Design a protein around this ligand. Sequence first.
Ligand SMILES: CCCCCCCCCCCCCCCCCC(=O)OC[C@H](COP(=O)([O-])OCC(O)COP(=O)([O-])OC[C@@H](COC(=O)CCCCCCCCCCCCCCCCC)OC(=O)CCCCCCCCCCCCCCCCC)OC(=O)CCCCCCCCCCCCCCCCC
Ligand SMILES: CCCCCCCCCCCCCCCCCC(=O)OC[C@H](COP(=O)([O-])OCC(O)COP(=O)([O-])OC[C@@H](COC(=O)CCCCCCCCCCCCCCCCC)OC(=O)CCCCCCCCCCCCCCCCC)OC(=O)CCCCCCCCCCCCCCCCC
Ligand SMILES: [K+]
Ligand SMILES: [K+]
Ligand SMILES: [K+]
Ligand SMILES: [K+]
Ligand SMILES: [K+]
Ligand SMILES: [K+]
Ligand SMILES: [K+]
Lengths: 557, 676, 190, 27
Amino acid sequence: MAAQGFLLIATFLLVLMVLARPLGSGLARLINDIPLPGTTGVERVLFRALGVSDREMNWKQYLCAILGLNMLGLAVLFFMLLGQHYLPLNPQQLPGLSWDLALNTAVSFVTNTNWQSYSGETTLSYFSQMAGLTVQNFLSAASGIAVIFALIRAFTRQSMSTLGNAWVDLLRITLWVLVPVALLIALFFIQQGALQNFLPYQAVNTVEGAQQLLPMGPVASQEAIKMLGTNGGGFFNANSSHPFENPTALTNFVQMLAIFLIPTALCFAFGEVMGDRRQGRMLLWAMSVIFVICVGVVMWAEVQGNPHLLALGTDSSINMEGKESRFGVLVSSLFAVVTTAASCGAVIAMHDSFTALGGMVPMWLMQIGEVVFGGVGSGLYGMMLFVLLAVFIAGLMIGRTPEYLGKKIDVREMKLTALAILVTPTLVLMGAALAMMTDAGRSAMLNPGPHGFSEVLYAVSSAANNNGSAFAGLSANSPFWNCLLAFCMFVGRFGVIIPVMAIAGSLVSKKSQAASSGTLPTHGPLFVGLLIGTVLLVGALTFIPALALGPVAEYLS
Amino acid sequence: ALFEPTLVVQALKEAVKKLNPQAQWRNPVMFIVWIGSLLTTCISIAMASGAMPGNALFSAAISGWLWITVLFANFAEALAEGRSKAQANSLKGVKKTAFARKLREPKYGAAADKVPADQLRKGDIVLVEAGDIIPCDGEVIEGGASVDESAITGESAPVIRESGGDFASVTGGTRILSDWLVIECSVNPGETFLDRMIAMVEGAQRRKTPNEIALTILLIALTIVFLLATATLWPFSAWGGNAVSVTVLVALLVCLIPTTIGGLLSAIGVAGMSRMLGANVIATSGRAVEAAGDVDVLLLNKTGTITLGNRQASEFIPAQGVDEKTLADAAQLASLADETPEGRSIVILAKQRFNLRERDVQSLHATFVPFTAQSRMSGINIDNRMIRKGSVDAIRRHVEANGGHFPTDVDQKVDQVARQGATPLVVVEGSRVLGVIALKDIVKGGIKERFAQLRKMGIKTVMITGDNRLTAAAIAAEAGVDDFLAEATPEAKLALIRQYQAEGRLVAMTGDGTNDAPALAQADVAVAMNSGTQAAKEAGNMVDLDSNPTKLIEVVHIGKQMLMTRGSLTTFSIANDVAKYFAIIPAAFAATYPQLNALNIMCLHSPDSAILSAVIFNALIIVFLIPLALKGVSYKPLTASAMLRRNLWIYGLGGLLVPFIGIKVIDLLLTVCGLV
Amino acid sequence: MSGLRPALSTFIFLLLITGGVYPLLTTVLGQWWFPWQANGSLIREGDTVRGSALIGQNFTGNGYFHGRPSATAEMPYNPQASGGSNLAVSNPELDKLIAARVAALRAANPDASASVPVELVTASASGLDNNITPQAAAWQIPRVAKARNLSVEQLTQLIAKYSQQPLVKYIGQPVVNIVELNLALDKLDE
Amino acid sequence: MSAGVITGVLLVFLLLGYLVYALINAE
Ligand SMILES: CCCCCCCCCCCCCCCCCC(=O)OC[C@H](COP(=O)([O-])OCC(O)COP(=O)([O-])OC[C@@H](COC(=O)CCCCCCCCCCCCCCCCC)OC(=O)CCCCCCCCCCCCCCCCC)OC(=O)CCCCCCCCCCCCCCCCC
Ligand SMILES: CCCCCCCCCCCCCCCCCC(=O)OC[C@H](COP(=O)([O-])OCC(O)COP(=O)([O-])OC[C@@H](COC(=O)CCCCCCCCCCCCCCCCC)OC(=O)CCCCCCCCCCCCCCCCC)OC(=O)CCCCCCCCCCCCCCCCC
Ligand SMILES: [K+]
Ligand SMILES: [K+]
Ligand SMILES: [K+]
Ligand SMILES: [K+]
Ligand SMILES: [K+]
Ligand SMILES: [K+]
Ligand SMILES: [K+]
């Protein structure tokens, strides 16, 4: 099935590039101050109504706007989830959440991590998941795209100190990139089998006569933005394994394309805005090579699967435990790699029930920092930090001062790049230590041996790296786990947005420089290989001792 | 040149141990290694005192080798510092004499005294005669003889100091041996380039370059993530089984931390400054050299910078009815009495072209006529008709007065000389004009090869002249520059500098006179020469002792060499750590996780031997890379996308592969020595 | 700076347009275009719900096509608590569970081969799954045929009729619909 | 009562604070 897996990867990347080139052109148009075609008349009256105009503000006010929007959203979502009992749309009369769970999921849904330690069948009402959870899945994604818009505008702007308008950026993104594609994705999900309704929980008298309660609800409208905005976190407990939430392999392929749609379109938009598309194709090659070897290694590991299955008496060795039957081993491996490299966080196969080698590579992909098609604009700047590191070390290689797209790199961006790089490994390596010293975190295991530590490391790394995908065996509903993961998500989001914005504010002041026929070619196979080597080396020099006691020890056991 | 001598290496090895207590924390990487050394020493002491159990000999060996790692880093730094101080003390104090010649009258009828040069200050005339030391720097307003600047510059050939106009510059620490001269004190001794150089080398602490600061920030980030990856591994293994010992953790931490470049950044910087000092260039800061290692444009003059001489004969053009041999013979007759360098060039070119060597001077029956500028013409009375050579207008006036007219062929070849960019000199035999000799300004300095070297490097060698565009382009084609400039006014020079600076690139120039002192001030790389004026030297950025216009090539070479050295050592120390993972990770956890025992692909003897071999290799790689850090990497002028290939294929592949060999060989030696 | 009125206006407008408009418009379009699929794809006869076509229920009878084993919280195939077994590949509890499942299947299928398919012994990702591969559903034809007096050929056209292959052969797996197959099988037997 | 980790965590935080202060400063 190696040929089938390779052909699936090839057609996925081909359809992704085809569907991401025109969205890349549209996102480049949105990065520039020009509006989209055919929408200026509603644009001017909407901004007149909202009072958001004539504000070409710097990095300080742009970051303050983004942070204020996210804090306001955090407060609204937290109070809605804490007081969801009095709010309408209660078919099951589900009570209000506790303080720890409510704060954990509030920070989770406003920091674009979407970690879910609860069950959506029996924990949240319809109005919660329809009016707070969907709006924060929109707003965190729009905040990420707004921050990467600010960074790309800083790279393309010459000497002024003004990045743009955060409110205008958020409004255009949410109203003409997220929503009009979210309708198409949600309507396709309805057309293929997902549900969208507000009925009470339908009771089933099955063939055997045992009673069965079916959880209905607005599933596909949440699911569309949950996939498109690289959000993750399902309406149900099974994020994307649930047949009411991802019914068909066609819907799964559309889900994968939606997960990688906006990072690839943002790389294309970066190439179009900077003037030459080779500087975007460089980034796309750098992410795509790592993605291809990661999905190949995972696919091989899951095809090899459980070695005890033939000894127990089965016929095939493929690890189909914790994987659906509608999706193959190859499709589950590809979705795991996609949702874990992009920091989406929704699973069609339970990651905890994986082979050790096949579960290391998703975990390692989160370890390196979500740079392989990561985030929704929140992985483009994560890769851009490694790009600045690579151009610094290559400038030191050639003997010139460091440079990237004409602009110079000195200690002001170097301090901020170093801080933004080391925010997330710091959080991972202190959270995985604090959880493994406290008894309340050490008692949340489900598997013995090194796999329990692997579960803790996976959980804290998905929290700190804004992924949300879980080794689901970790019973993380404790107050200690809720508070620790909320702190990890909060700091690992807003301690990377702040130094990236300070990098943008520093870079927007200094003037670009021509090629001068002696500078390092940033576009090319040499720089693609150097950037890939930098990413893999930095991600596998601070985490090989951490991974050796988990998945590597489990695989060599 | 110093090939690491035993006279100084031990004298700095004694000063190495002074850098241990509080000279470490300015270097964060080496301070973390020092703190780990002290922590493991305390653990070994309490572990051999019975408070803590285990193999205290292994912890003591780890502590000793960590201390030797710190001593090796301080040894590289002290070796660079000692070599720089040796160069500084070799340049300084060739002769210190307090002989003043204190006086008031510049003429040779003045008195003398024995005032120290520290008191003789602020523009005092100093009359020095032959065989006496020149006290301080200044200019020679009267005199002109052969000075001996060998003890300061480093040359061997004698140099002729020309008083007034061109070589109005003298230094402190030189000898005059031909005639008596007068010296102005000018700037104070103590504020000269030599005293500034010894001030920043010896004594005062040198400042870090912004590139060194950025590399230090990167190394701090790497040691932070390595500290967080190496600590918070005791809680990872406490659940897994028995907890890993703290000594193995600190050994793994020091192995992971970029010690190779962290202990050698200062050595690289001081070695670069010493290579400046050994290339007869004085730079007051390393930032100047590292900014010179970035410039793309060169701005150099042509009055003495390229064309080392006046307009001299290069070609002969006969037009009609006059053979070149007879023309050269008549020109040699006319220019027999002409001691000017243009006359000597005419003589040597005519003898080169027609073997005109032997002349019967006694049978000439002529009267020698010297060059007189009042009639601006010269010649000889060889025949009844008189032959004279000078400016074309005076020649035409003299011919018209004698009774002859201007010829058409002579006029058109003078016009061709004028458009080709040469000074037209005409030979006239009586009433008949023979020919006109083209005298272009001659380079004769061997700068075409260096400009080809610069084009291989990729530097825009902009050349500036003061004459018309046709002459400038004609000499620019032969010199080999890509850009030529004409009609040099200082406003136009500074406008060109501002045009190049505002476009984005960094500029570099080599001005010597005081006229372009504002250009040297608003020039990033101002390579002032030793023969240049004191005001230009004190207003510029760097001082060139050898007074060579091609020294900026060596300056850019060394400035690129130091950045290349620190970047290559950075990637060596970063790619170096995969072998410490493959040597320590299967060895640190062999008694707690026997499943991951199969990770030591080098197949080492024991976990203790593997950890000890990794620590010993980390200690020894510093010593083994001291010579490369001191000498710099091999500079080759290559493509910006090919020198990266060469540097990666050497140093990154070395970081992957060399430590495998090093750890395996050191473990083999430890096995055959019976230690493990 | 002082931009609370832009901040509150933008946040409130985006909250409206993505909470009370986008889910409402999506619900209106779904319930007006594809109402059966937007209403959970339920199966109704005689004003009674026999389960949706996607969820699947626990079938324990000796004359039914058994699906993949469940790992839900309280009872197997419980939609109120989704999520399968998060047991690692190196879990002795997982090995004991697989041994018990394969022993029960080999005891319950005497005519079938001893090479039990991996789907019928391993749990699902969601804890509930209405689908098995036809290569695994063909393993249970002799048992069902002996239990309900049917024929292997007729059961083969039944499985082929209720098999839903994907649009592209390699983007998923060929699967059957266990609930629909069991209801049609009971209607055929009745 | 928790010696061997109560000083190790403090020393690790002290070294981390010193190193991040060195990254912030331009000593
Ligand atoms: C057990 C071990 C097994 C190991 C197996 C390993 C196998 C690895 C195979 C690797 C294959 C090589 C890479 C694929 C071809 C590269 C395509 C390309 O360069 O597009 C540039 C393309 C044009 O570049 P250009 O030539 O410079 O032209 C400049 C013009 O101005 C720009 O003009 P333009 O951009 O508008 O172009 C117009 C367009 C025409 O206009 C159109 O609208 C048509 C549609 C355009 C689609 C664009 C898709 C671009 C990406 C296609 C990649 C598909 C395969 C990816 C997966 C392969 C690996 C699994 O023309 C095209 O460029 C389309 C080219 C069609 C690609 C053909 C498919 C590749 C063959 C592989 C499948 C078949 C193999 C079977 C046999 C294999 C042997 C066993 O630019 C883009 O379209 C943007 C894409 C930028 C991202 C590149 C994506 C890279 C993905 C590959 C990752 C795999 C690497 C990892 C391998 C292992 C490490 C080494
Ligand atoms: C530690 C190990 C150190 C290794 C050091 C390696 C140093 C030597 C490298 C080997 C070169 C040998 C000497 C040169 C011979 C000439 C070779 C040549 O033709 O140029 C190729 C290239 C030179 O290109 P260049 O210098 O940029 O300029 C020349 C032109 O640009 C080139 O021509 P062009 O670009 O104008 O047009 C060619 C064009 C079409 O023109 C042609 O038809 C002629 C060329 C035919 C090529 C094959 C036709 C297919 C073309 C479609 C593009 C697909 C390319 C292949 C993709 C896979 C297919 C299976 O095909 C293209 O490639 C254009 C596509 C645009 C870029 C796409 C990026 C390709 C993906 C590369 C992935 C690399 C992953 C490496 C694995 C990770 C290892 C870390 O040399 C290489 O092979 C480099 C690739 C390997 C890089 C590894 C080095 C990094 C590892 C160090 C990591 C440590 C970092 C430590 C950091 C620590 C933290 C601070
Ligand atoms: K996420
Ligand atoms: K999730
Ligand atoms: K990151
Ligand atoms: K992130
Ligand atoms: K990292
Ligand atoms: K770093
Ligand atoms: K090292």
